[PDB]
Amino acid sequence: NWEHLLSLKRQGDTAKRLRIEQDDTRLGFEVDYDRIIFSAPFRSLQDKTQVIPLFVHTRLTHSLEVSVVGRSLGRMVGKKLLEKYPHLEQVYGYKFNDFGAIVAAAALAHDIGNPPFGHSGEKAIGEFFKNGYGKRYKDSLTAKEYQDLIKFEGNANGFKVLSQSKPGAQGGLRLSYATLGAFMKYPKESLPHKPSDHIADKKYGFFQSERALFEDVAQELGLLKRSTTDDVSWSRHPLAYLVEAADDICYTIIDFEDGINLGLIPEEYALEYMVKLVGQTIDRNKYNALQETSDRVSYLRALAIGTLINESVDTFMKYEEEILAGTFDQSLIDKSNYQAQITDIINLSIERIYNSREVIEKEIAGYEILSTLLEARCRALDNNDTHYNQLIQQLLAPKSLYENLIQICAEVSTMTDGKALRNYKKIKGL
């Protein structure tokens, strides 16, 4: 039910928060966005690389653009949802901007827990615990505690970042449960691993340390169960599909834009790859009058993103009842009439950007930087009495074993590119 899915609950609440009694200048969903903007984890995205080493998008500007696309998706979907379910507005007091605000906030935070150097950063952390120094802990951990480490997931670390309790600050950012639900695109634990080909099963969305919190979130929202074993799993909050589409749209089109501006993709390819996405709306005489590459490609990007937003809204509304019943199996973009063109764009970016020598060099270096930092933290954990290990604790980190290891991963993951490289260089004498 949408009334439950739009929960304003915050962690620890003892009483219900009715939408009709909200102060509209202090709307819980919009406070959520402001809390993320000013948070230390969001600010650190300023100094973190998205794909191409550091104009190129950093994590912060990527997340900003995704939240803008997400707000537009949520606004347009919210308006059609309120005309489909008019009791949501007439009885309960919901407004179209509420949906825009939920998606905008979840989208703003979607990459907040990701480690440096991208997917290699996650693999480097995983490999450290699978076959590196961290392997020795296996027998002291449950299967799921260990799986959290060997398949260390940035989405799950983001949920920890958003909700972590510390002295003086229980509940992290204390976001609305509707926002936490829109954030959670993999509502399952680390095991079982990929139980189906469904997008929501491709990874997992919370660590064992956050399991009890997401249990509270899922019951408050009324999310549908996807497992009746002790391995817990739920169907995605409907608005998580819009967070994912905003993200899909932005890195597809905007990585392409960056690749052209950086000279990694020949400009000769720009129209060829964008023509079907922009063909009906492009003012071609205007395009031909633009004198700078960056102006031409930003014009194409805006048209293609506009095309994909409108189509994504229609796809959501067309499958709304399957999404509400937890039986929708794909992403919104999987259903696009432009799936062939999106795939061509992504494949060109893989060939020209992700496999460029510079991106490869960064990923290889990132493996050495993260492995070194994890080994130093973990040896210091195992022997905190030696002089060297006390120095290491003082430089990098001034509980149960699992809690200690998952915290080490979270702290390594949240270091800025320059801070991780500086610490690595000092540990190695440079």
Q: Is 354 labeled as ligand-binding? A: yes
Q: Is 247 labeled as ligand-binding? A: yes
**Minimum Å distance from CB 106 to Mn ion?**
12
Q: Which does 248 bind (CB under 5 to 8 A by kind): Mn ion, a second copy, none?
A: none
Q: Which does 289 bind (CB under 5 to 8 A by kind): Mn ion, a second copy, none?
A: none
Q: Is 138 labeled as ligand-binding? A: no
**Minimum Å distance from CB 71 to Mn ion?**
15
CA distances from 345 to 57, 277, 351, 420 (A): 18, 11, 10, 32
Q: Which does 377 bind (CB under 5 to 8 A by kind): Mn ion, a second copy, none?
A: none
Q: Which does 355 bind (CB under 5 to 8 A by kind): Mn ion, a second copy, none?
A: a second copy
> How far is the C-alpha of 281 from the C-alpha of 122, rounded, in Å?
40
Query: Which residue pairs, CB below 8 angstroms and at least 24 apart, start in 420-423?
Result: 420/116, 420/369, 420/370, 420/373, 421/369, 423/373, 423/395, 423/396
**Minimum Å distance from CB 202 to a second copy?**
16
Its sign, for the CA torsion 157, 109, 322, 325, is positive
Q: Is 59 labeled as ligand-binding? A: yes
Q: Is 295 labeled as ligand-binding? A: no
> How far is the C-alpha of 424 from the C-alpha of 98, rounded, in Å?
44
**Minimum Å distance from CB 204 to a second copy?**
18
Q: Is 35 labeled as ligand-binding? A: yes
* Residue 49 or 176 with smaller CB distance to a second copy: 49
The residues near 26 (Cβ < 8 Å, ≥ 6 apart) are none
Rg (CA), the chain: 22
Q: What counts of helices (H) and strands (E) characterise the chain?
A: 21, 0
Q: Is 26 labeled as ligand-binding? A: yes
Query: Which residues sit at the interface with a second copy, rule CB under 8 A?
Result: 120, 123-124, 127, 355, 357, 360-369, 372, 386-388, 391-392, 394-395, 421-422, 424, 426-430
CA distances from 170 to 12, 200, 261 (A): 9, 29, 44
Amino acid at 310: N
> How far is the C-alpha of 426 from the C-alpha of 430, rounded, in Å?
6
* Residue 237 or 377 with smaller CB distance to Mn ion: 237
Name the residue among 70, 34, 59 with its Cα closest to residue 174. Answer: 34
For residue 201, state whether it binds Mn ion (rule: CB under 5 A). no
Of residues 100 through 119, those in contact with Mn ion by CB under 5 A are 111
Q: Which two tokens stand for residue 425?
A: 């260089």
* Residue 143 or 360 with smaller CB distance to a second copy: 360
Q: Which does 352 bind (CB under 5 to 8 A by kind): a second copy, Mn ion, none?
A: none
Residue 238: cis peptide before it, omega within 30 degrees of 0 = no
Q: Which does 111 bind (CB under 5 to 8 A by kind): Mn ion, a second copy, none?
A: Mn ion
Q: Which does 247 bind (CB under 5 to 8 A by kind): a second copy, Mn ion, none?
A: Mn ion
Q: How many C-beta neighbours within 10 Å does residue 364 have?
A: 13
Do residues 48 and 35 make contact, with C-beta atoms less than 8 angstroms apart?
no
Q: Which does 424 bind (CB under 5 to 8 A by kind): a second copy, Mn ion, none?
A: a second copy
**Minimum Å distance from CB 307 to a second copy?**
33
- The DSSP line for 343-376 is HHHHHHHIIIIITSHHHHHHHHHHHHHHHHHHHH
Amino acid at 264: L
The 244-263 contact track toward Mn ion, x by CB under 5 A, reads ---x----------------
Q: What is the contact surface with Mn ion in residues (CB under 5 A)?
A: 111, 247
Binding residues for dGTP: 50-51, 59, 155, 185, 203, 255, 354, 363
- Known binding-site residues for dATP equal 26, 34-35, 50, 72, 185-186, 255, 301, 354
- Binding region for Mg(2+): 62, 110-111, 247
